Design an enzyme around this catalytic site. Structure first.
Site, PDB file in Angstrom:
ATOM      1  N   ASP A  57     -73.118  12.072  25.863  1.00  0.00           N
ATOM      2  CA  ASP A  57     -73.531  10.990  26.771  1.00  0.00           C
ATOM      3  C   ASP A  57     -73.861  11.383  28.218  1.00  0.00           C
ATOM      4  O   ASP A  57     -72.974  11.546  29.063  1.00  0.00           O
ATOM      5  CB  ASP A  57     -72.444   9.900  26.763  1.00  0.00           C
ATOM      6  CG  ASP A  57     -72.846   8.659  27.538  1.00  0.00           C
ATOM      7  OD1 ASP A  57     -74.010   8.245  27.410  1.00  0.00           O
ATOM      8  OD2 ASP A  57     -72.019   8.089  28.283  1.00  0.00           O
ATOM      9  N   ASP A 104     -80.474   8.999  29.916  1.00  0.00           N
ATOM     10  CA  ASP A 104     -79.220   8.766  29.203  1.00  0.00           C
ATOM     11  C   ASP A 104     -79.334   8.908  27.688  1.00  0.00           C
ATOM     12  O   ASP A 104     -79.868   8.032  27.009  1.00  0.00           O
ATOM     13  CB  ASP A 104     -78.675   7.369  29.540  1.00  0.00           C
ATOM     14  CG  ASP A 104     -77.383   7.061  28.809  1.00  0.00           C
ATOM     15  OD1 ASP A 104     -76.730   8.014  28.318  1.00  0.00           O
ATOM     16  OD2 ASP A 104     -77.013   5.858  28.722  1.00  0.00           O
TER      17      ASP A 104
END
Lengths: 10, 389
Positions: B36, B232
């Site tokens: 992440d 992201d």
């Protein structure tokens, strides 16, 4: 069924 | 570069996240960790849960250290609460190091874990500024670099299949690569173009122009970064600020008007299906996002195809149709270049030089007529003005 990720709040 | 050891060390897909194998504790407890770049906390499930086949058992680790401190992390979607501690961590298909890192043992969570995802924790790869409880909690990558001499950068090649994968297929297939401390030339074609990280918190960047099949969206550029623009890997969709999203959808609808789709499709609420092999890719436009370059008054663009923004999803409805969900949605927190976008490129998070590089991914999905692209340079002026303050 379709998942979805939505990763931080600040 | 060439790091064959780490090539193909990822598994997963855009809708459930891409994860890497890690071991925590002594003796090693193997756990799959979601990669992440939109967060900065390393956390793992540490209590039973319906969606976890395994979790971190602190009582079985002789090297576990309790920091006696609670922690809470909320995300755009999902959140968890846990207890801080540190332990030894290794990455089996990563650099051959062992680091003592901060670890949030997840005790409670809501809509965080995902059924069938096969991952049990999360590796926040962004900066300390956004770590919880606060920036004194050193993120995993910062500890890796401080404790080992691994180069301060990592690269990601997330590979989308272009079709739905069932449970066994996702388990048995390679979802991509996370090269820690380097760049592997076998993962991309053409050259790498770099954009500057505007601020070290999220991996923030600046978009200076948007085109739909070559046609300029023509909005004040501050709108594209309205609030912020980040990269992201933990977000499935390409997410756009509300005004940009409305303009972008209006333009994509116009380019694809030879076919009509329900409003629900465009809202990502329903899928669209075509008979086996007949998805009309050609009617959908390519989307180009121009990014500020490293050279003054210079920019470059990355172009994605509908094969990137139309996410394959299975049709439980019994048929051989090819079905998809529209993977662009609105955001009220700025632009998010999610997995859908990263699947088209090899992305280099060069923390050392405070820049993010993009090259065409050697595993991106395309057809015989069009391919994703990374092109430059373009003379663009007053770009810093595109940034929101």
């Amino acid at each position: 069924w379709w998942s979805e990720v939505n990763x931080a709040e600040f | 570069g060439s790091f064959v050891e780490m090539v193909d060390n990822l598994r997963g897909k855009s809708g459930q996240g891409y994860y890497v194998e890690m071991t925590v504790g002594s003796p090693p407890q193997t756990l799959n960790i979601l990669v992440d770049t939109g967060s900065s906390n390393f956390a793992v499930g540490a209590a039973p849960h319906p969606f976890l086949h395994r979790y971190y058992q602190r009582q079985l680790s002789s090297t576990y250290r309790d920091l006696r401190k609670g922690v809470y992390v909320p995300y755009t979607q999902g959140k968890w609460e846990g207890e801080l501690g540190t332990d030894l961590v290794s990455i089996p298909h990563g650099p051959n190091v062992t680091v003592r890192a901060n670890i949030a043992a997840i005790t409670e969570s809501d809509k965080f874990f995902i059924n069938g995802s096969n991952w049990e924790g999360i590796l926040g790869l962004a900066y300390a500024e956004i770590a919880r409880p606060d920036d004194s909690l050193e993120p995993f990558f910062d500890s890796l670099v401080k404790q080992t001499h691994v180069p301060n950068l990592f690269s990601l090649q997330l590979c989308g299949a272009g079709f739905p994968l069932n449970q066994s297929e996702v388990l048995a297939s390679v979802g991509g690569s996370m090269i820690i401390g380097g760049i592997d030339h076998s993962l991309y074609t053409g050259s790498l173009w770099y954009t500057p990280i505007r601020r070290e918190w999220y991996y923030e960047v600046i978009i200076v122009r948007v085109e739909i099949n070559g046609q300029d969206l023509k909005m004040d550029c501050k709108e594209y970064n309205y609030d912020k623009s980040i990269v992201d890997s933990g977000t499935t969709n390409l997410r756009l600020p509300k005004k940009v999203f409305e303009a972008a959808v209006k333009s994509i609808k116009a380019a694809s008007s030879t076919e009509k789709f329900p409003d629900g499709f465009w809202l990502g609420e329903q899928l669209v299906c075509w008979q086996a092999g007949t998805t009309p890719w050609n009617i959908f436009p390519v989307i180009s996002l121009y990014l500020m370059g490293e050279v003054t008054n210079q920019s470059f663009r990355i172009t994605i195809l509908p094969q990137q923004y139309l996410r394959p999803v299975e049709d439980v409805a019994t048929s051989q149709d090819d079905c998809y969900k529209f993977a662009i949605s609105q955001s009220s927190t700025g632009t998010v270049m999610g997995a859908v976008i990263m699947e088209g490129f090899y992305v280099v998070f060069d923390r050392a030089r405070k820049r993010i590089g993009f090259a065409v991914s050697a595993c991106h999905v395309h057809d015989e007529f069009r391919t994703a692209a990374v092109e430059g340079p373009f003379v663009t002026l007053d770009m810093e003005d595109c940034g929101y303050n």
